[PDB]
Ligand binder design. Sequence first.
Ligand SMILES: O=C(O)C1=C(c2ccc3ncsc3c2)CCC1
Length: 166
Amino acid sequence: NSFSGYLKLTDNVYIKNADIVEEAKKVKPTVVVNAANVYLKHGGGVAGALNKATNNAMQVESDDYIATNGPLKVGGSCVLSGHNLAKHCLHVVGPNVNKGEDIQLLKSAYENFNQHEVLLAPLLSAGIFGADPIHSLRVCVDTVRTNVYLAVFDKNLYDKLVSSFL
Ligand SMILES: O=C(O)C1=C(c2ccc3ncsc3c2)CCC1
């Protein structure tokens, strides 16, 4: 949990312009959050990047989880191994608003972070999920009460978030 170069947004939310995969390799946090889907198929975005950094070990493990437990629900989560990136990976499903999934579920997705004291995480429902990233940061700030270190890869997006926030 040796986080460096973050800007403190609120008492418990920090932000950095960084690749979450590289942050995970440097820090080796207790928990890294994955922006997952209900079947834990890590095909792109943060999910594909995190899976790729474990050389597909996260996917093989996720397939076994789904066969034994069934899919997650939108707004839900599960804890699996963090492999070489972290002690644990908290897979969290935010709503895919481009597929008509309710934005009210973005609050439920962020509530999952509260079961862990410190997390390294991406913004939820950003990218292909289609939610407004600045709105996603507002829900995170209103909902998360534990210590969250947000990593945002795209510098144009990071700059828009920091500008809107401070
Ligand atoms: O820039 C980001 O914060 C965002 C994404 C992303 C995509 C690929 C990727 N590979 C390594 S870190 C990473 C983040 C998807 C949407 C938001």
